[PDB]
Amino acid sequence: AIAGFIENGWEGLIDGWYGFRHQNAQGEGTAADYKSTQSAIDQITGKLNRLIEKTNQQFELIDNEFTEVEKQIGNVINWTRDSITEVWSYNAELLVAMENQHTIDLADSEMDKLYERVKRQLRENAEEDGTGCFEIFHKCDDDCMASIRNNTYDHSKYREEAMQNRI
Amino acid sequence: AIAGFIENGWEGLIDGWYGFRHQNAQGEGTAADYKSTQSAIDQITGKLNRLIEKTNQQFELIDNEFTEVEKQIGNVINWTRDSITEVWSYNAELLVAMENQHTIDLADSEMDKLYERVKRQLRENAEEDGTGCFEIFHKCDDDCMASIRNNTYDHSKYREEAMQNRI
Amino acid sequence: AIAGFIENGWEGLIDGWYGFRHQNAQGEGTAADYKSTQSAIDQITGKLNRLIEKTNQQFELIDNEFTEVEKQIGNVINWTRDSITEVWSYNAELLVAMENQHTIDLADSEMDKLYERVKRQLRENAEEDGTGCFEIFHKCDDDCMASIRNNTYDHSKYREEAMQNRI
Amino acid sequence: DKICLGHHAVSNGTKVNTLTERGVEVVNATETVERTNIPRICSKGKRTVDLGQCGLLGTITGPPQCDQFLEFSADLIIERREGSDVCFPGKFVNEEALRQILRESGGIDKEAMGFTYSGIRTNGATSSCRRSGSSFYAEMKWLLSNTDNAAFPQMTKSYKNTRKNPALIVWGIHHSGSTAEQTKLYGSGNKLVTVGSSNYQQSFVPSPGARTQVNGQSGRIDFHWLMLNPNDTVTFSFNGAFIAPDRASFLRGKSMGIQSGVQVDADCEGDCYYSGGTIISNLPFQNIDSRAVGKCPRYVKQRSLLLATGMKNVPE
Amino acid sequence: DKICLGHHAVSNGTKVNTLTERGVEVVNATETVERTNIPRICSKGKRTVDLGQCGLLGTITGPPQCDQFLEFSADLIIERREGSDVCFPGKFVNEEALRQILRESGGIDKEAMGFTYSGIRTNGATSSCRRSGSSFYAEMKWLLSNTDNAAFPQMTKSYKNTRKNPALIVWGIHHSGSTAEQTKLYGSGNKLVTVGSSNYQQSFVPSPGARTQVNGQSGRIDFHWLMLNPNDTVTFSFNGAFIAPDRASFLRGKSMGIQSGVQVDADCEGDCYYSGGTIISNLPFQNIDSRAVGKCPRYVKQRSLLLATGMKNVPEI
Amino acid sequence: DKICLGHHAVSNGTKVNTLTERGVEVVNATETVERTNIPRICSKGKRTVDLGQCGLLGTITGPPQCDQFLEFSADLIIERREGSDVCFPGKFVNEEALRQILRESGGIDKEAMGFTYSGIRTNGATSSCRRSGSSFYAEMKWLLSNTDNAAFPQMTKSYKNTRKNPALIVWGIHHSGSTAEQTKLYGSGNKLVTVGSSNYQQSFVPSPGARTQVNGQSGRIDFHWLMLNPNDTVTFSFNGAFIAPDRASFLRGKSMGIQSGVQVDADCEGDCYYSGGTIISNLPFQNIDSRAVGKCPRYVKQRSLLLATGMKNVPE
Ligand SMILES: *[C@@H]1O[C@H](CO)[C@@H](O)[C@H](O[C@@H]2O[C@H](CO)[C@@H](O)[C@H](O)[C@H]2NC(C)=O)[C@H]1NC(C)=O
Ligand SMILES: *[C@@H]1O[C@H](CO)[C@@H](O[C@@H]2O[C@H](CO)[C@@H](O)[C@H](O)[C@H]2NC(C)=O)[C@H](O)[C@H]1NC(C)=O
Ligand SMILES: *[C@@H]1O[C@H](CO)[C@@H](O[C@@H]2O[C@H](CO)[C@@H](O)[C@H](O)[C@H]2NC(C)=O)[C@H](O)[C@H]1NC(C)=O
Ligand SMILES: *[C@@H]1O[C@H](CO)[C@@H](O)[C@H](O)[C@H]1NC(C)=O
Ligand SMILES: *[C@@H]1O[C@H](CO)[C@@H](O)[C@H](O)[C@H]1NC(C)=O
Ligand SMILES: *[C@@H]1O[C@H](CO)[C@@H](O)[C@H](O)[C@H]1NC(C)=O
Ligand SMILES: *[C@@H]1O[C@H](CO)[C@@H](O)[C@H](O)[C@H]1NC(C)=O
Ligand SMILES: *[C@@H]1O[C@H](CO)[C@@H](O)[C@H](O)[C@H]1NC(C)=O
Ligand SMILES: *[C@@H]1O[C@H](CO)[C@@H](O)[C@H](O)[C@H]1NC(C)=O
Numbered sequence A, B, C: 001a002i003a004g005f006i007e008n009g010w011e012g013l014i015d016g017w018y019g020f021r022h023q024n025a026q027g028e029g030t031a032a033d034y035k036s037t038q039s040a041i042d043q044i045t046g047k048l049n050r051l052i053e054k055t056n057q058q059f060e061l062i063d064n065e066f067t068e069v070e071k072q073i074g075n076v077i078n079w080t081r082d083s084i085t086e087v088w089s090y091n092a093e094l095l096v097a098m099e100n101q102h103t104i105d106l107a108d109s110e111m112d113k114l115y116e117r118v119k120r121q122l123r124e125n126a127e128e129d130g131t132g133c134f135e136i137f138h139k140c141d142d143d144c145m146a147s148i149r150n151n152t153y154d155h156s157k158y159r160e161e162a163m164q165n166r167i
Numbered sequence D, F: 001d002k003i004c005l006g007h008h009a010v011s012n013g014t015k016v017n018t019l020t021e022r023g024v025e026v027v028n029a030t031e032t033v034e035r036t037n038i039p040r041i042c043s044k045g046k047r048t049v050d051l052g053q054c055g056l057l058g059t060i061t062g063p064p065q066c067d068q069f070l071e072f073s074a075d076l077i078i079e080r081r082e083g084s085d086v087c088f089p090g091k092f093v094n095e096e097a098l099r100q101i102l103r104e105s106g107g108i109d110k111e112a113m114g115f116t117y118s119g120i121r122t123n124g125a126t127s128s129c130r131r132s133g134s135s136f137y138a139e140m141k142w143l144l145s146n147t148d149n150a151a152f153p154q155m156t157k158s159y160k161n162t163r164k165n166p167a168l169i170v171w172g173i174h175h176s177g178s179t180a181e182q183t184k185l186y187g188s189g190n191k192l193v194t195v196g197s198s199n200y201q202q203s204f205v206p207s208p209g210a211r212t213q214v215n216g217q218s219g220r221i222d223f224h225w226l227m228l229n230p231n232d233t234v235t236f237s238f239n240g241a242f243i244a245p246d247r248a249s250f251l252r253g254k255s256m257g258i259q260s261g262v263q264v265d266a267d268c269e270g271d272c273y274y275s276g277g278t279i280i281s282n283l284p285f286q287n288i289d290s291r292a293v294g295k296c297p298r299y300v301k302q303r304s305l306l307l308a309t310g311m312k313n314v315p316e
Numbered sequence E: 001d002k003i004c005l006g007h008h009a010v011s012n013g014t015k016v017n018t019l020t021e022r023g024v025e026v027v028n029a030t031e032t033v034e035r036t037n038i039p040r041i042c043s044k045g046k047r048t049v050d051l052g053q054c055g056l057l058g059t060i061t062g063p064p065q066c067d068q069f070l071e072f073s074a075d076l077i078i079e080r081r082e083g084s085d086v087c088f089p090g091k092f093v094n095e096e097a098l099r100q101i102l103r104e105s106g107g108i109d110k111e112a113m114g115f116t117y118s119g120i121r122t123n124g125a126t127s128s129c130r131r132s133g134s135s136f137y138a139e140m141k142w143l144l145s146n147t148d149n150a151a152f153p154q155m156t157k158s159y160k161n162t163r164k165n166p167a168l169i170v171w172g173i174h175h176s177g178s179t180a181e182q183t184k185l186y187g188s189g190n191k192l193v194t195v196g197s198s199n200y201q202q203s204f205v206p207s208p209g210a211r212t213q214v215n216g217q218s219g220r221i222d223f224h225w226l227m228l229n230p231n232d233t234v235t236f237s238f239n240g241a242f243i244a245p246d247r248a249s250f251l252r253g254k255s256m257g258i259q260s261g262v263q264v265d266a267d268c269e270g271d272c273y274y275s276g277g278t279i280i281s282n283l284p285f286q287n288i289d290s291r292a293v294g295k296c297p298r299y300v301k302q303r304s305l306l307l308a309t310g311m312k313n314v315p316e317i
């Protein structure tokens, strides 16, 4: 019924970027994580703040549109300008390609940080199903779904039941 | 005898880049992972398609081999060309170094993605021994090898097998 | 009392970069992992040796400070130099930012490699607690933990005691 | 019970170029290459001189069409395609260096040189330049050689620059268009003009040949210029065809000059300009004008580059 | 049972440079910097002119070496070291700018000036240029007076550019080898050549005098050029010492030029050329010639750079 | 019981930048941009000629400030702000190109021409510069008339350049202070100078100046430069006002000339030189001088960029 980031995304998660889905006794539900989305957003915002900034070097005109400059100096200026344009076109294409690769890998990394943190938090009380979800073998209510959502979950008081359900 | 990527590469894989080795009571040997190889090859070929992209900028001569240009403009052209050459040598070495680091890290990451896929598929039925091998406690000589290579493996039937035997 | 890299670093680990901290009935102490720090520092030194490479292109004077060159050629030279300065300032910021991100990510990936190596070597005899430590369920002395640092800990021990302690 | 971790998605996202794959769909992305512009010049908070019917160099020699801009003060100088630097036909040597100096000049602060002449007609009226009747450049004196055919004496004049800033000194050489007209206007004989200073030296000779008639006249004025260091002196020596300066041009400070074909909109703020308008954007790159002047994004060939502002799109 | 993952490896492999460490062994890697070439210029699908003995600038003035190339039309212009654009010693002023104009010009379409002369013989000739017997440059008339020591009259000529394209107008000034030669050639007097147009004005003064002998004679021609806007008129004024154009040179379109020492190959399609041949290879970089022109890979200094096409070659045990 | 993994951290870390966040604290970091120079020009293992009041261009003509450097060898050429390339006032045409080739020249060699023609005063001198009494550049003769108010004879002279290397030929044209000075130095006439070669062919005409007074005199020498291909012949032809060379000059090797205002040291070695000193550093970048000469770090605008050499500094 529900699947995680391994096979598909979750259309409908309007508030935030990262979150949890639940299949509880009360049925299906969705909630935002809020911390991981804000971390990813802060990092992307930082990247944009570094790249989306204007320079401080003012450039003057060295040619003239109305009256053409001398052919030898005009051709040297045009060659230098075209080589600079090639350098900045290369730098812009490379910058956008690595920043898109870093943004995508960053977001998948943040999804993974949330996933490993939840795995470490659940310890032996949950087992991976291979689709980005954790199958929990101790019957746990909404108060305990919320305990999983934030960093308040305590391994104690579920270990014996989850192990007996797994063994 | 059954080497792993963590310690050593394989010289027996001629049908691809990534694959599996098997040891059981019916036989021993290797098989290639078609999907992982094709994915890694498609990403590297796309990388090359970006790098090998032809430039559309037409450059003209601004110097002269047969006669010499004026020494001041000549030295300005030589300096500009050498500075541009230093820029392109820097970009070429940075690009090759970053593409080689990204290519090696990408292929090893893809090996990790497949490795995690196998671990996730097996769940409680196998243990990582740190050499790149999975020690499997569910005895299978034939169908399980193809099933594990594919995604069409139903770990639950043998699950009982991978707890009794490892406890 | 003791927390690892997930929550905090160490201030008393003067010798080395990567290391272990130990609590037992015989006392407490800290010891560095020579191989991990030596590998990480060798990689960082190689990175520095690449960055500190000196160019073999000797640049000459084009402008003249005591007697100003002609305004048109002087302004073309100043525009070209300012554009090259912008290119090298961009490349310098991009290189320093990328290498700082790769140094931080390298240190954390290597720390994770050491973490996984310990988990792989211990198998079911230890469980991560989520704060950068592995809880050892059976009791042991300093020598077997030194063997863990020494990469000579044999898991083929009386597993049943650790299993009974977990269950 | 089961919990699933994951991320949001949209039914229709946007595509970005990554290192290995050309078309990765992402939830969100923004442009890094600016393509939008405003057809008007954004010049708010800056002193702007709209040099209609007048070029940058016309503020030095003073053709009638530039009379209001002789002592202009500006932070932004806008040169127009329909304008001209020269009214009586002619041109400058090293036009580009002088225009580059004027664009950065901060405006022009002129001071009279104090040259007094006697026995010389200083009217120099020409039908090609008019305010009323026939009137030559306001700021240049065309030293005719008295009554027709009279000899022109070999005069020596000098100007000392006493200010902290260097002086811009401009003069011309008159090419009469024929030897009959040069003999009539400046008298008979060969003419020579020399200019000296500490760090500049030159000589000029008139060329009274024959030229294509432009704006009613076939002669041409070749304009020359000198940058005079503080506390130095420029000395001129001439047998005629000197077209003497009346005032020296000093630099007011710093400014930036632009070329533009569109009207000025003084309620818009920006600091980088191009021929067809202004580019107000904080994006790192542009695809508008490869020769734009000012603090504009860096020019790239690519029409559009999308830098992802969100993760990858996985449609389900 | 057991399963294990692994990866392909080879006994040898190659080495690459990575971001953190140099000399990483990989299974395979390719070069991004080209070093192999064809020692010949490959030009197919383009009109190519091979200016063997004649320099590109002579395609305006018409030395005998390029009588067949006076009105040449080409997409690719080959200039060779052994050629010269001078048959009577001399040179163009700002010759590099004019060479740059001609390389991009697409060829030369010449339209007659329509000039008529009277009282001046136009059959000037030199022993340096030897088209047959003694002949002068084809596209220019060497004006004399009449007989030896005869005065040269002052005259004015003009040409209107009636086409939509700008005209390239080229003329020369003759600097005699001595004042005695000028006494024989152009008589005696002060010489002044004046050239003007709506956006151009210049004048030239001949300077007779002894010079080192080149190709057997000391006299020299300095060649000058003008770019004439449509509907504009160039006015010329002479007192002598003028090498007059007979036809204006119009540009045909767009082309590129090559300075090279190798033969032309009509079979390969190529974009990047250098003095030793052509570089036909879709690699990011080249380390062959820093002045290569056309749609060419970027020049780098490294002898080679190996970019991995696979992962690190962890050897088998 | 518990095995812990962790890493070394420091309580007072260093801030570095990353692609994603600024001000990230790391355990250790170094600089990649050098800001510290050594105030002295430290030159060892390279032959250095420490010019004083003589610039590099003047080493062709031989002014009294550097008579000891009329011929020299060097790997390093140092020009000074307080120096001069002239003693008698003058200026070179295309002086920057000539200085540029001299900085690379490796030193200077010599040959000689002659100018032994009768009727000519070959040892002219001025009051501007002296060795004891009035003197002149060792490398030039002036060619004044043998007696006052005597017509200068027209003459030709040529140099065959019988050497493998191209010859550096420098000669002057004298622009008299006034026409009366020209009559005093040379007899009446229309002065003309031509220089022929297979690729130079340049004409010059003296233009009496009536210029300002520099170093006590109003006249001036205009120095002209020709670089002569091997085995080519330079032919000079003149009617006077020709500051003839005594010696023909040649290049010696390879050098890297610099301009500076500071003293020369010699107890260390380095390759990067600039107006204020040298840069001895292996860092990839520097922020001292955009005009730095030699095999040195690349100029950037940033004062400092810190490259992390350690782990992220997470405390406790
Ligand atoms: C620097 O500029 C000079 C002219 O100002 C130019 O001669 C140099 O290159 C020349 O290139 C020729 C063709 O490759 C070569 O034969 C010649 O030896 C070489 N000049 C020198 C001194 O080696 C320009 N430098 C470069 C690197 O092109
Ligand atoms: C240098 O490049 C500019 C364009 O970036 C050239 O200017 C153009 O020239 C064409 C010639 O037909 C005109 O149609 C365009 O309108 C011009 N554009 C501008 C903005 O001026 C310039 O001619 C080139 N320089 C040389 C020497 O060719
Ligand atoms: C090119 O830029 C340099 C600055 O790097 C200019 O040199 C400075 O010019 C100012 C003008 O007042 C002087 O005060 C400085 O002392 C100069 N510094 C140096 C190191 O020369 C130079 O004038 C510019 N050139 C042109 C043609 O504009
Ligand atoms: C975690 O969520 C539960 C939900 O009710 C809340 O009561 C608790 O205070 C939260 N704890 C923290 C630390 O946010
Ligand atoms: C598993 O994949 C192999 C091809 O590698 C195929 O022949 C086999 O039929 C697949 N097994 C199943 C159950 O689909
Ligand atoms: C570590 O391993 C080496 C392997 O030879 C062994 O000699 C050494 O004694 C070991 N040390 C410890 C503390 O186990
Ligand atoms: C993309 O992000 C920008 C700013 O974060 C926002 O204004 C815009 O609406 C977003 N678009 C979509 C489709 O999410
Ligand atoms: C010019 O020289 C005088 C000499 O006393 C000095 O007082 C004055 O300040 C100088 N002016 C400039 C602009 O250098
Ligand atoms: C490895 O790369 C080389 C590059 O030339 C290629 O020829 C070879 O076929 C490649 N090998 C494989 C197995 O892809």
Ligand SMILES: *[C@@H]1O[C@H](CO)[C@@H](O)[C@H](O)[C@H]1NC(C)=O
Residues within 6 Å of the ligand: E163, E164, E230, E231
């Ligand atoms: C001026 O030139 C244009 C082409 O640029 C041409 O159409 C027009 O007819 C010309 N003017 C005259 C009067 O022929």
Ligand SMILES: *[C@@H]1O[C@H](CO)[C@@H](O)[C@H](O)[C@H]1NC(C)=O
Residues within 6 Å of the ligand: F012, F013, F014, F015
């Ligand atoms: C390092 O410590 C000193 C004082 O101990 C302090 O002034 C300095 O700011 C610290 N460094 C940083 C980066 O805060």
Ligand SMILES: *[C@@H]1O[C@H](CO)[C@@H](O)[C@H](O)[C@H]1NC(C)=O
Residues within 6 Å of the ligand: F010, F027, F028, F029, F309
């Ligand atoms: C940082 O590394 C350098 C390497 O030379 C060392 O000298 C310095 O002491 C180190 N500083 C710290 C705080 O580790």
